[PDB]
């Protein structure tokens, strides 16, 4: 795969080039956010197709990864957009919501603060978002065929490429070897929090009777082949 | 203040190894075949006994007791199921296809079916054991990972402002940096190149994200069965910590 030949700088360029635009709300709160997330999803699918290595996978494995990652991806984008607005979640430039408008809100806000405190760079962000896409679903492949084993191996190799890329960016920025490893750890541990927030978000989508809103396997499959 | 941040990599490993809890047994000779209730009974009984020893273990994780009692409990509240789960996965590593809940309670995938919605978590736990096996996870790495879960899982949900809260969060991040250094030291000692060290560290920390997911699914299923009574309260944890 061409993905496994990329330098750190090419991987970053690829991910930066693939970035979706920031969309605006049409501007009911749940109505606006749902409409926005639906439009974001179309772009996420096209973004995913541009993440190096992703289209080397079967369609089935592409969908499984997107099924497992979609809410975490939306969330990390939200946190990134909100970074320079302490106390507020910038769902869109015309939909900026404060804490008063809560437990999920608070978790999202804590994550933005952590990104701010770490001075998270755009190049690091796109790497993290790609890790989420490839990592979130990799441990729940149901098949045990040779093909499935080959697919999981490929994902882990691309994930290794993204690690190397993160370390390269840090070394370029002048971090010592020790600082490089510590910052890599700090970034990857936040992913564990993003998973948690996705899980809480999902359970809250269900709790509001919005089970209709999560993209099915079939929806994603049809969107991928489109 | 605290000498936790002054430990070397070797002292940190020694501390964590020394702090490791015992392996407990399940209730002896239960009525086999299991019902849903009796399976849940055995696991609950086991988890409850394990919890006491986890708290003793936690108190020996360097830096943990430098935190307020409130922050200690918050961390344990957020991590307890992930901690039980990673212990289960480690115990089961050398038993492919099976979950070694205890030396006298080894369960294969088919026995997960004896409780509704159980088999999917069973499957995720088994996939994780396979991943640990494939990576040849070492005991010294495992104790590092288990400590990361304890300190990391709840750190982002001290939403508190204030100097004390900032100091607490900073201390946790510093101890977490110390555990990272320790993991890297172990890898370098074992002869890994710099590139291999960073890649293995990443692979280990990314599995933590799957353990979180499994904890969340487990919890949602505990609730779904009407077992909210099974999760340790703030008060229980606090009383066990001060004991
Ligand atoms: O977890 S919540 O449900 C959910 C997750 C997040 O917010 C909601 C959502 C969403 C909404 C409709 C969808 O179809 C799909 C996703 C998100 C999202 C959307 C776009 C995007 O780019 C990033 C994230 N939530 C919690 C909090 F408020 F804190 F964010 C929430 C609750 C009630 C509200 O009234 C508003 C939001
Ligand atoms: O995630 S589940 O809840 C939960 C995880 C694991 O099984 C259950 C459990 C537990 C049980 C009762 C407790 O009070 C507290 C913990 C575990 C445990 C116990 C001791 C230990 O050292 C390690 C793990 N689950 C598990 C799975 F599905 F994989 F079998 C599950 C789901 C639906 C049904 C039945 C069980």
Describe this structure in words.
The structure is a homodimer. The first copy, chain A, is mainly alpha-helical and 226 residues long. Chain A contains eight helices and two strands. Chain A has a single domain (1-226), classed as Orthogonal Bundle (Retinoid X Receptor). In chain A, 67% of the residues lie in helices and 4% in strands. In chain A, helix 3 (59-82) packs across helix 4 and helix 3 (59-82) packs across helix 8 (217-225). Chain A starts with 7 loop residues before the first helix and ends with a helix. At the A-B interface, helix 4, helix 6 and helix 7 of A face helix 4, helix 6 and helix 7 of B. The complex binds the ligand O=S(=O)([C@@H]1C[C@@H]2O[C@H]1C(c1ccc(O)cc1)=C2c1ccc(O)cc1)N(CC(F)(F)F)c1ccc(OCc2ccccc2)cc1 (2 copies). Residues 29-30, 33-34, 36-37, 40, 74-75, 77-78, 91, 104-105, 108, 201, 204-205, 213 of chain A line the site of one copy of the ligand O=S(=O)([C@@H]1C[C@@H]2O[C@H]1C(c1ccc(O)cc1)=C2c1ccc(O)cc1)N(CC(F)(F)F)c1ccc(OCc2ccccc2)cc1. Chain A: One of its GO terms (cellular component) is cytosol. Chain A: 17beta-estradiol binds at residues 40, 81, 204. Chain A: Residues 7-226 are annotated as: Transactivation AF-2. Chain A: Residues 1-226 are annotated as: Self-association.
